[PDB]
Design a protein around this nucleic acid. Structure first.
Ligand SMILES: Nc1ncnc2c1ncn2[C@H]1CC[C@@H](COP(=O)(O)OP(=O)(O)OP(=O)(O)O)O1
Ligand SMILES: OC[C@H]1O[C@@](CO)(O[C@H]2O[C@H](CO)[C@@H](O)[C@H](O)[C@H]2O)[C@@H](O)[C@@H]1O
Ligand SMILES: [Mg+2]
Ligand SMILES: [Mg+2]
Lengths: 411, 556
DNA sequence: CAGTCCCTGTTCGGGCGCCG
DNA sequence: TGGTCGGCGCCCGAACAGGGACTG
């Protein structure tokens, strides 16, 4: 008996129509059990084929959780609702969250089930549950409450959320709280033990309003990955040719790079393995270049209107490099990941872990998730990615095949 | 209250701002009219159909075709114009059940609902739009106008509404009988239990009573008490299954339409018959105009078709699924980008077979194609059994390790073991990581004129070796490849090559063993003969070394 | 600095097979 | 006679996307 905030799609846009993909037996069993309880509790109810909208559903286990979590791929619906959540009820982003020594992420999605959902909107939350070997046709549902993973859920519930938060916020003014979809980001500068304790305080606070979470971040530890030039006692023609190619590409980012004195070293038509002593002019040109690469790019700043783009490169030996940017060659952050889960045995698991970590940093730093350019073949990713996914959100991605002429980001 | 109400209906709006179909009927031959009039008049007595006064301003064509393997006739309505204006549904039929999915059951019953579409009520408000006019032996007698009171055949909402309505009815029975297996596909029901045969028939009749309550009638004629059951085009036996026999046309002269039937038959056959190959038979269909046109069979498509028929000669069968035992998929390379696979649990007792022949990319190798087959098999398995089989692959463990660790794309194969069945899949050549000491260094470049299509390809080397070759009807890309080919032709068994072509370097670094381009194939042929090749890239027009010199030669 | 042309890869609708 | 609906599979060709290199 709560008022339902009306919702509308962006003008001229129909609802999502996205086929359900095949699910493993364990995921289907988990979903059938989850949906039976949700139907009994009135959160969802069965629907007919007359509803023409569908969104994919599958199940995940969060890191170390061991307990299945229903997850709906609302990316198509969210884009169709995109104006409403950012324009009307959007959450301001705390520039200070990235500076806190410790940040914990809490899954408050269960709270969303309290509020009901606009009756006219429920037609768009439809999802079909498949059956092994197509024994039965698809069992369709739709949501009667605010669904987890929809971008309207945290916005409609923001009025409710702040009142629940407000006693805790006054008691600890310094602590910073940010809400992205089903997640609550809680950042303190306290020592480890006090921090964990204050999270328990905010847990009880959530409990008496009608959920345990242990995922801890340290955004101050986060560092960047500078472009680096090799140090060599002696340089072959091949070494200088590689260096010139790397510097020339780098000069699209740092305009102060100069290759003239290093190019002079390769004037002839020489064997690749021939050793070339460096001249003083080249030593200094190389020195000045190494200094420039320590510097920041001029006039790179985040723009709230523009989308974030993330690019990833597979460097081998379990190493991955990424760049986040909005305009080409204006990189807001660049990083490297090593020794992740599945290192040396599984590229797809490692790439999956990388996408999650990069998305998390973007939520913390900018309150957005980037669009990923993934170094993988579309069919390889789609076959396996859900097997390794442990997050409650899903970024946008596309697939690229760029062979690496030069190793600019790694060494 | 002229018509009674049976089971819950499904609201069905028209597309907004659009109105019901009006289009004149077909000039139906009187021979068909005899069958149609007899059946259609019967419908009104049941309440399936109703007469309408001219207050109903809608007309939609009608026709009929005989039920296969039966004397009965099928009553179809060409609702093409009504579909266009009817609201969109979400299909609930997500795929086809496969017999390899089925577990062994002690007692199996296959039963068929009768007049399944005609037993499900249409939406009350929507009933008006059905309207069609019946025809007579002459054009003198007008014929009555009729509106459906139930789901009709030829509409676009009929299958989804029936399947959803059927599922709702079945759900109470399956909740009361958790240990009964019911495969529901359209109106065909497969019922399997481990109950002893007498007790099983009790549940079967009890299920028939349950369906009867909602007006669903299961005639004895389509009841299947005794094996082998006929289900989804398969023959089901207690411990094995097989496809119902497939007849392949014998024609001495083949048209285009002929080959399509053939190909489509062999694809159906390859789900159990191992080693079916359609590559050369499909080669005949590429770039053809008329479906009617006659085409002669090459000695490739003929030899293929010969052994394809002989594989079908011997009867083969699949087994059923034992959740206790592992799933295993074995793949063999069949040549010319053709792969076949077998999925089994006990050795030599196959659950199903299949083929992956898709040519993907202009340049590729066997390792990529093997990876594609593994993915296709994995998704196919998740549909049928909900798990990934263990893979037995004709690729050495070290070959795979060299490929995936060095490739620039994320790539992965799930748990697998090596099987030593030739032909093994391997990398035909390996590019060096570092420049080769004592090998001649070839600086290669090529250019071409966009307008004339004339160009040059050439190289310069540290030893003083030089070449320039004129080329006609080429492109910049093609001359860049040509330059690399020239260096490979004219070099010893170990060679360093420096190019500024990102295009060429990208193709060659992916270690292709096959290409659509003949030029790449010749480059491959040379790469295989070398002992060591180091390819390196430099940026053009930067005044680098040999690259500047060879660029001047080919630009001329 | 636009505008092409190469070249590649994706998508989508057509035909057939199969199931109601 | 030629003619309907939905689902899935294959193989095809055409239409479309987009990234580099080169032309003014
Ligand atoms: N060629 C076709 N066109 C349109 N719909 C069709 C169809 N073939 C089948 N269907 C649809 C229509 C309904 C269903 C047909 O199944 P049954 O062949 O078994 O005919 P049923 O109505 O059940 O009568 P029964 O044989 O039991 O006496 O699938
Ligand atoms: O991976 C591509 C696959 O995306 C689908 C199915 O889930 O779309 C989802 O992912 C897209 C890419 O991020 C989003 O653009 C889309 O909104 C989302 O539904 C497919 O239709 C597509 O083939
Ligand atoms: Mg029937
Ligand atoms: Mg050149």
């Amino acid at each position: 008996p709560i008022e339902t905030v009306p919702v509308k799609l962006k003008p001229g846009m129909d609802g999502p129509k996205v086929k359900q993909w095949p699910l493993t037996e364990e995921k289907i069993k988990a979903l059938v059990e989850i949906c039976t309880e949700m139907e009994k509790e009135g959160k969802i109810s069965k629907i007919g084929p007359e509803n023409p909208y569908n969104t994919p559903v599958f199940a995940i286990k969060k890191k170390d959780s061991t307990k299945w979590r229903k997850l709906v791929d609302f990316r198509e619906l969210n884009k169709r609702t995109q104006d409403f959540w950012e324009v009307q009820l959007g959450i301001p982003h705390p520039a200070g969250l990235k500076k806190k020594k410790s940040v914990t992420v809490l899954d408050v999605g269960d709270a969303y089930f309290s509020v009901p959902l606009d009756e006219d909107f429920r037609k768009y939350t439809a999802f079909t549950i498949p059956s092994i070997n197509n024994e039965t046709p698809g069992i369709r549902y739709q949501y009667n409450v605010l669904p987890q993973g929809w971008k309207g859920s945290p916005a409609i519930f923001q009025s409710s959320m702040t009142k629940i938060l407000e006693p805790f916020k006054k008691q600890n003014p310094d602590i910073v709280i940010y809400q992205y979809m089903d997640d609550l980001y809680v950042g303190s500068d306290l020592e480890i033990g006090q921090h964990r304790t204050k999270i328990e305080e905010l847990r009880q606070h959530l409990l008496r309003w009608g959920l345990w979470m242990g995922y801890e971040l340290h955004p101050d530890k986060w560092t960047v990955q500078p472009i680096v030039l090799p140090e060599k006692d002696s340089w072959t023609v091949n070494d200088i040719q590689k260096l010139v190619g790397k510097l020339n590409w780098a000069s699209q980012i740092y305009p102060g790079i100069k290759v003239r004195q290093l190019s002079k070293l390769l004037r002839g038509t020489k064997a690749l393995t021939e050793v070339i002593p460096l001249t003083e002019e080249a030593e200094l040109e190389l020195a000045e270049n190494r200094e420039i690469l320590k510097e920041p790019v001029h006039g790179v700043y985040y723009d709230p209107s523009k989308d974030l783009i993330a690019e990833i490169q597979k460097q081998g030996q379990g190493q991955w490099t990424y760049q986040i940017y909005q305009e080409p060659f204006k990189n807001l952050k660049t990083g490297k990941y090593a020794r992740m889960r599945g290192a040396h045995t599984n590229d797809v698991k490692q790439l999956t872990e990388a996408v999650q970590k990069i998305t998390t940093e973007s939520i913390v730093i900018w309150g957005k998730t980037p669009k990923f350019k993934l170094p993988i073949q579309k069919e390889t990713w789609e076959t396996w990615w859900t097997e390794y996914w442990q997050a409650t959100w899903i970024p946008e991605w596309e697939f690229v095949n760029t062979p690496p002429l030069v190793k600019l980001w790694y060494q | 209250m002229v018509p009674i109400s049976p089971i819950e209906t499904v609201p069905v709006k028209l597309k907004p701002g659009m109105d019901g179909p009006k289009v004149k009927q077909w000039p139906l031959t009187e021979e068909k009219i005899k069958a149609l009039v007899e059946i259609c008049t019967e419908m009104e007595k049941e309440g399936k159909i109703s007469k309408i006064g001219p207050e109903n301003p809608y007309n939609t064509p009608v026709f009929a075709i005989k039920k296969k393997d039966s004397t009965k006739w099928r009553k179809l309505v060409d609702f093409r114009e009504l579909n266009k204006r009817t609201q969109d549904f979400w299909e609930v039929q997500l795929g086809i059940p496969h017999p390899a999915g089925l577990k062994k059951k002690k007692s199996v019953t296959v039963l068929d609902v009768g007049d399944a579409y005609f037993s499900v009520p249409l939406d009350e408000d929507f009933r008006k739009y059905t309207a069609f006019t019946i025809p007579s032996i002459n054009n003198e007698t007008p014929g009555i106008r009729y509106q459906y009171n139930v789901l009709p055949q030829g509409w676009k909402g009929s299958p989804a509404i029936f399947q959803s309505s059927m599922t709702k009815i079945l759900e109470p029975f399956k909740k009361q009988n958790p240990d009964i297996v019911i495969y529901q596909y359209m109106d065909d029901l497969y019922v399997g239990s481990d109950l002893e045969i007498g007790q099983h028939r009790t549940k079967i009749e009890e299920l028939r009573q349950h369906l009867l309550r909602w007006g669903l009638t299961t005639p004895d004629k389509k009841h299947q008490k005794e094996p082998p059951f006929l289900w989804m085009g398969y023959e089901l036996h207690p411990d094995k299954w097989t496809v119902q026999p497939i007849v392949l046309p014998e024609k001495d002269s083949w048209t285009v339409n002929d080959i399509c039937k053939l190909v489509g038959k062999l694809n159906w056959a390859s789900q159990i018959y191992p080693g079916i190959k359609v590559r050369q038979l499909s080669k005949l269909l590429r770039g053809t105009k008329a479906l009617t046109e006659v085409i002669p069979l090459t000695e490739e498509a003929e030899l293929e078709l010969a052994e394809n028929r002989e594989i079908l000669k011997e009867p083969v069968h699949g087994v059923y699924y034992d959740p206790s035992k592992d799933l295993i998929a074995e793949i063999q390379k069949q040549g010319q980008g053709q792969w076949t696979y077998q999925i089994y649990q006990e050795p030599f007792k196959n659950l199903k077979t299949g083929k992956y022949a898709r040519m993907r990319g202009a340049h590729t190798n066997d390792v990529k194609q093997l990876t594609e087959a593994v993915q296709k098999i994995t998704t196919e398995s998740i549909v049928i059994w909900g798990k990934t089989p263990k893979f037995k692959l004709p690729i050495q463990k070290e070959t795979w390790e060299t490929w995936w660790t060095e490739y620039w794309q994320a790539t992965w194969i799930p748990e697998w073991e090596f099987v030593n069945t030739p032909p093994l899949v391997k990398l035909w050549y390996q590019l060096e990581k570092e420049p080769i000491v004592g090998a001649e260094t070839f600086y290669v470049d090529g250019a071409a004129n966009r307008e004339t299509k004339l160009g040059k390809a050439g190289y310069v080397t540290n030893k003083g070796r030089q070449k320039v070759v004129p080329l006609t009807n080429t492109t910049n890309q093609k001359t860049e490849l040509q330059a690399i080919y020239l260096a490979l032709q004219d070099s010893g068994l170990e060679v360093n090559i420096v190019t500024n072509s990102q295009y060429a370097l990208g193709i060659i670094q992916a270690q292709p063993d096959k290409s659509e381009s003949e030029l790449v194939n010749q480059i491959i042929e040379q790469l295989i003969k070398k002992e060591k090749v180091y390819l390196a890239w430099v940026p053009a027009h930067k005044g680098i070394g040999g690259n500047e010199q060879v660029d001047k030669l080919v630009s001329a």
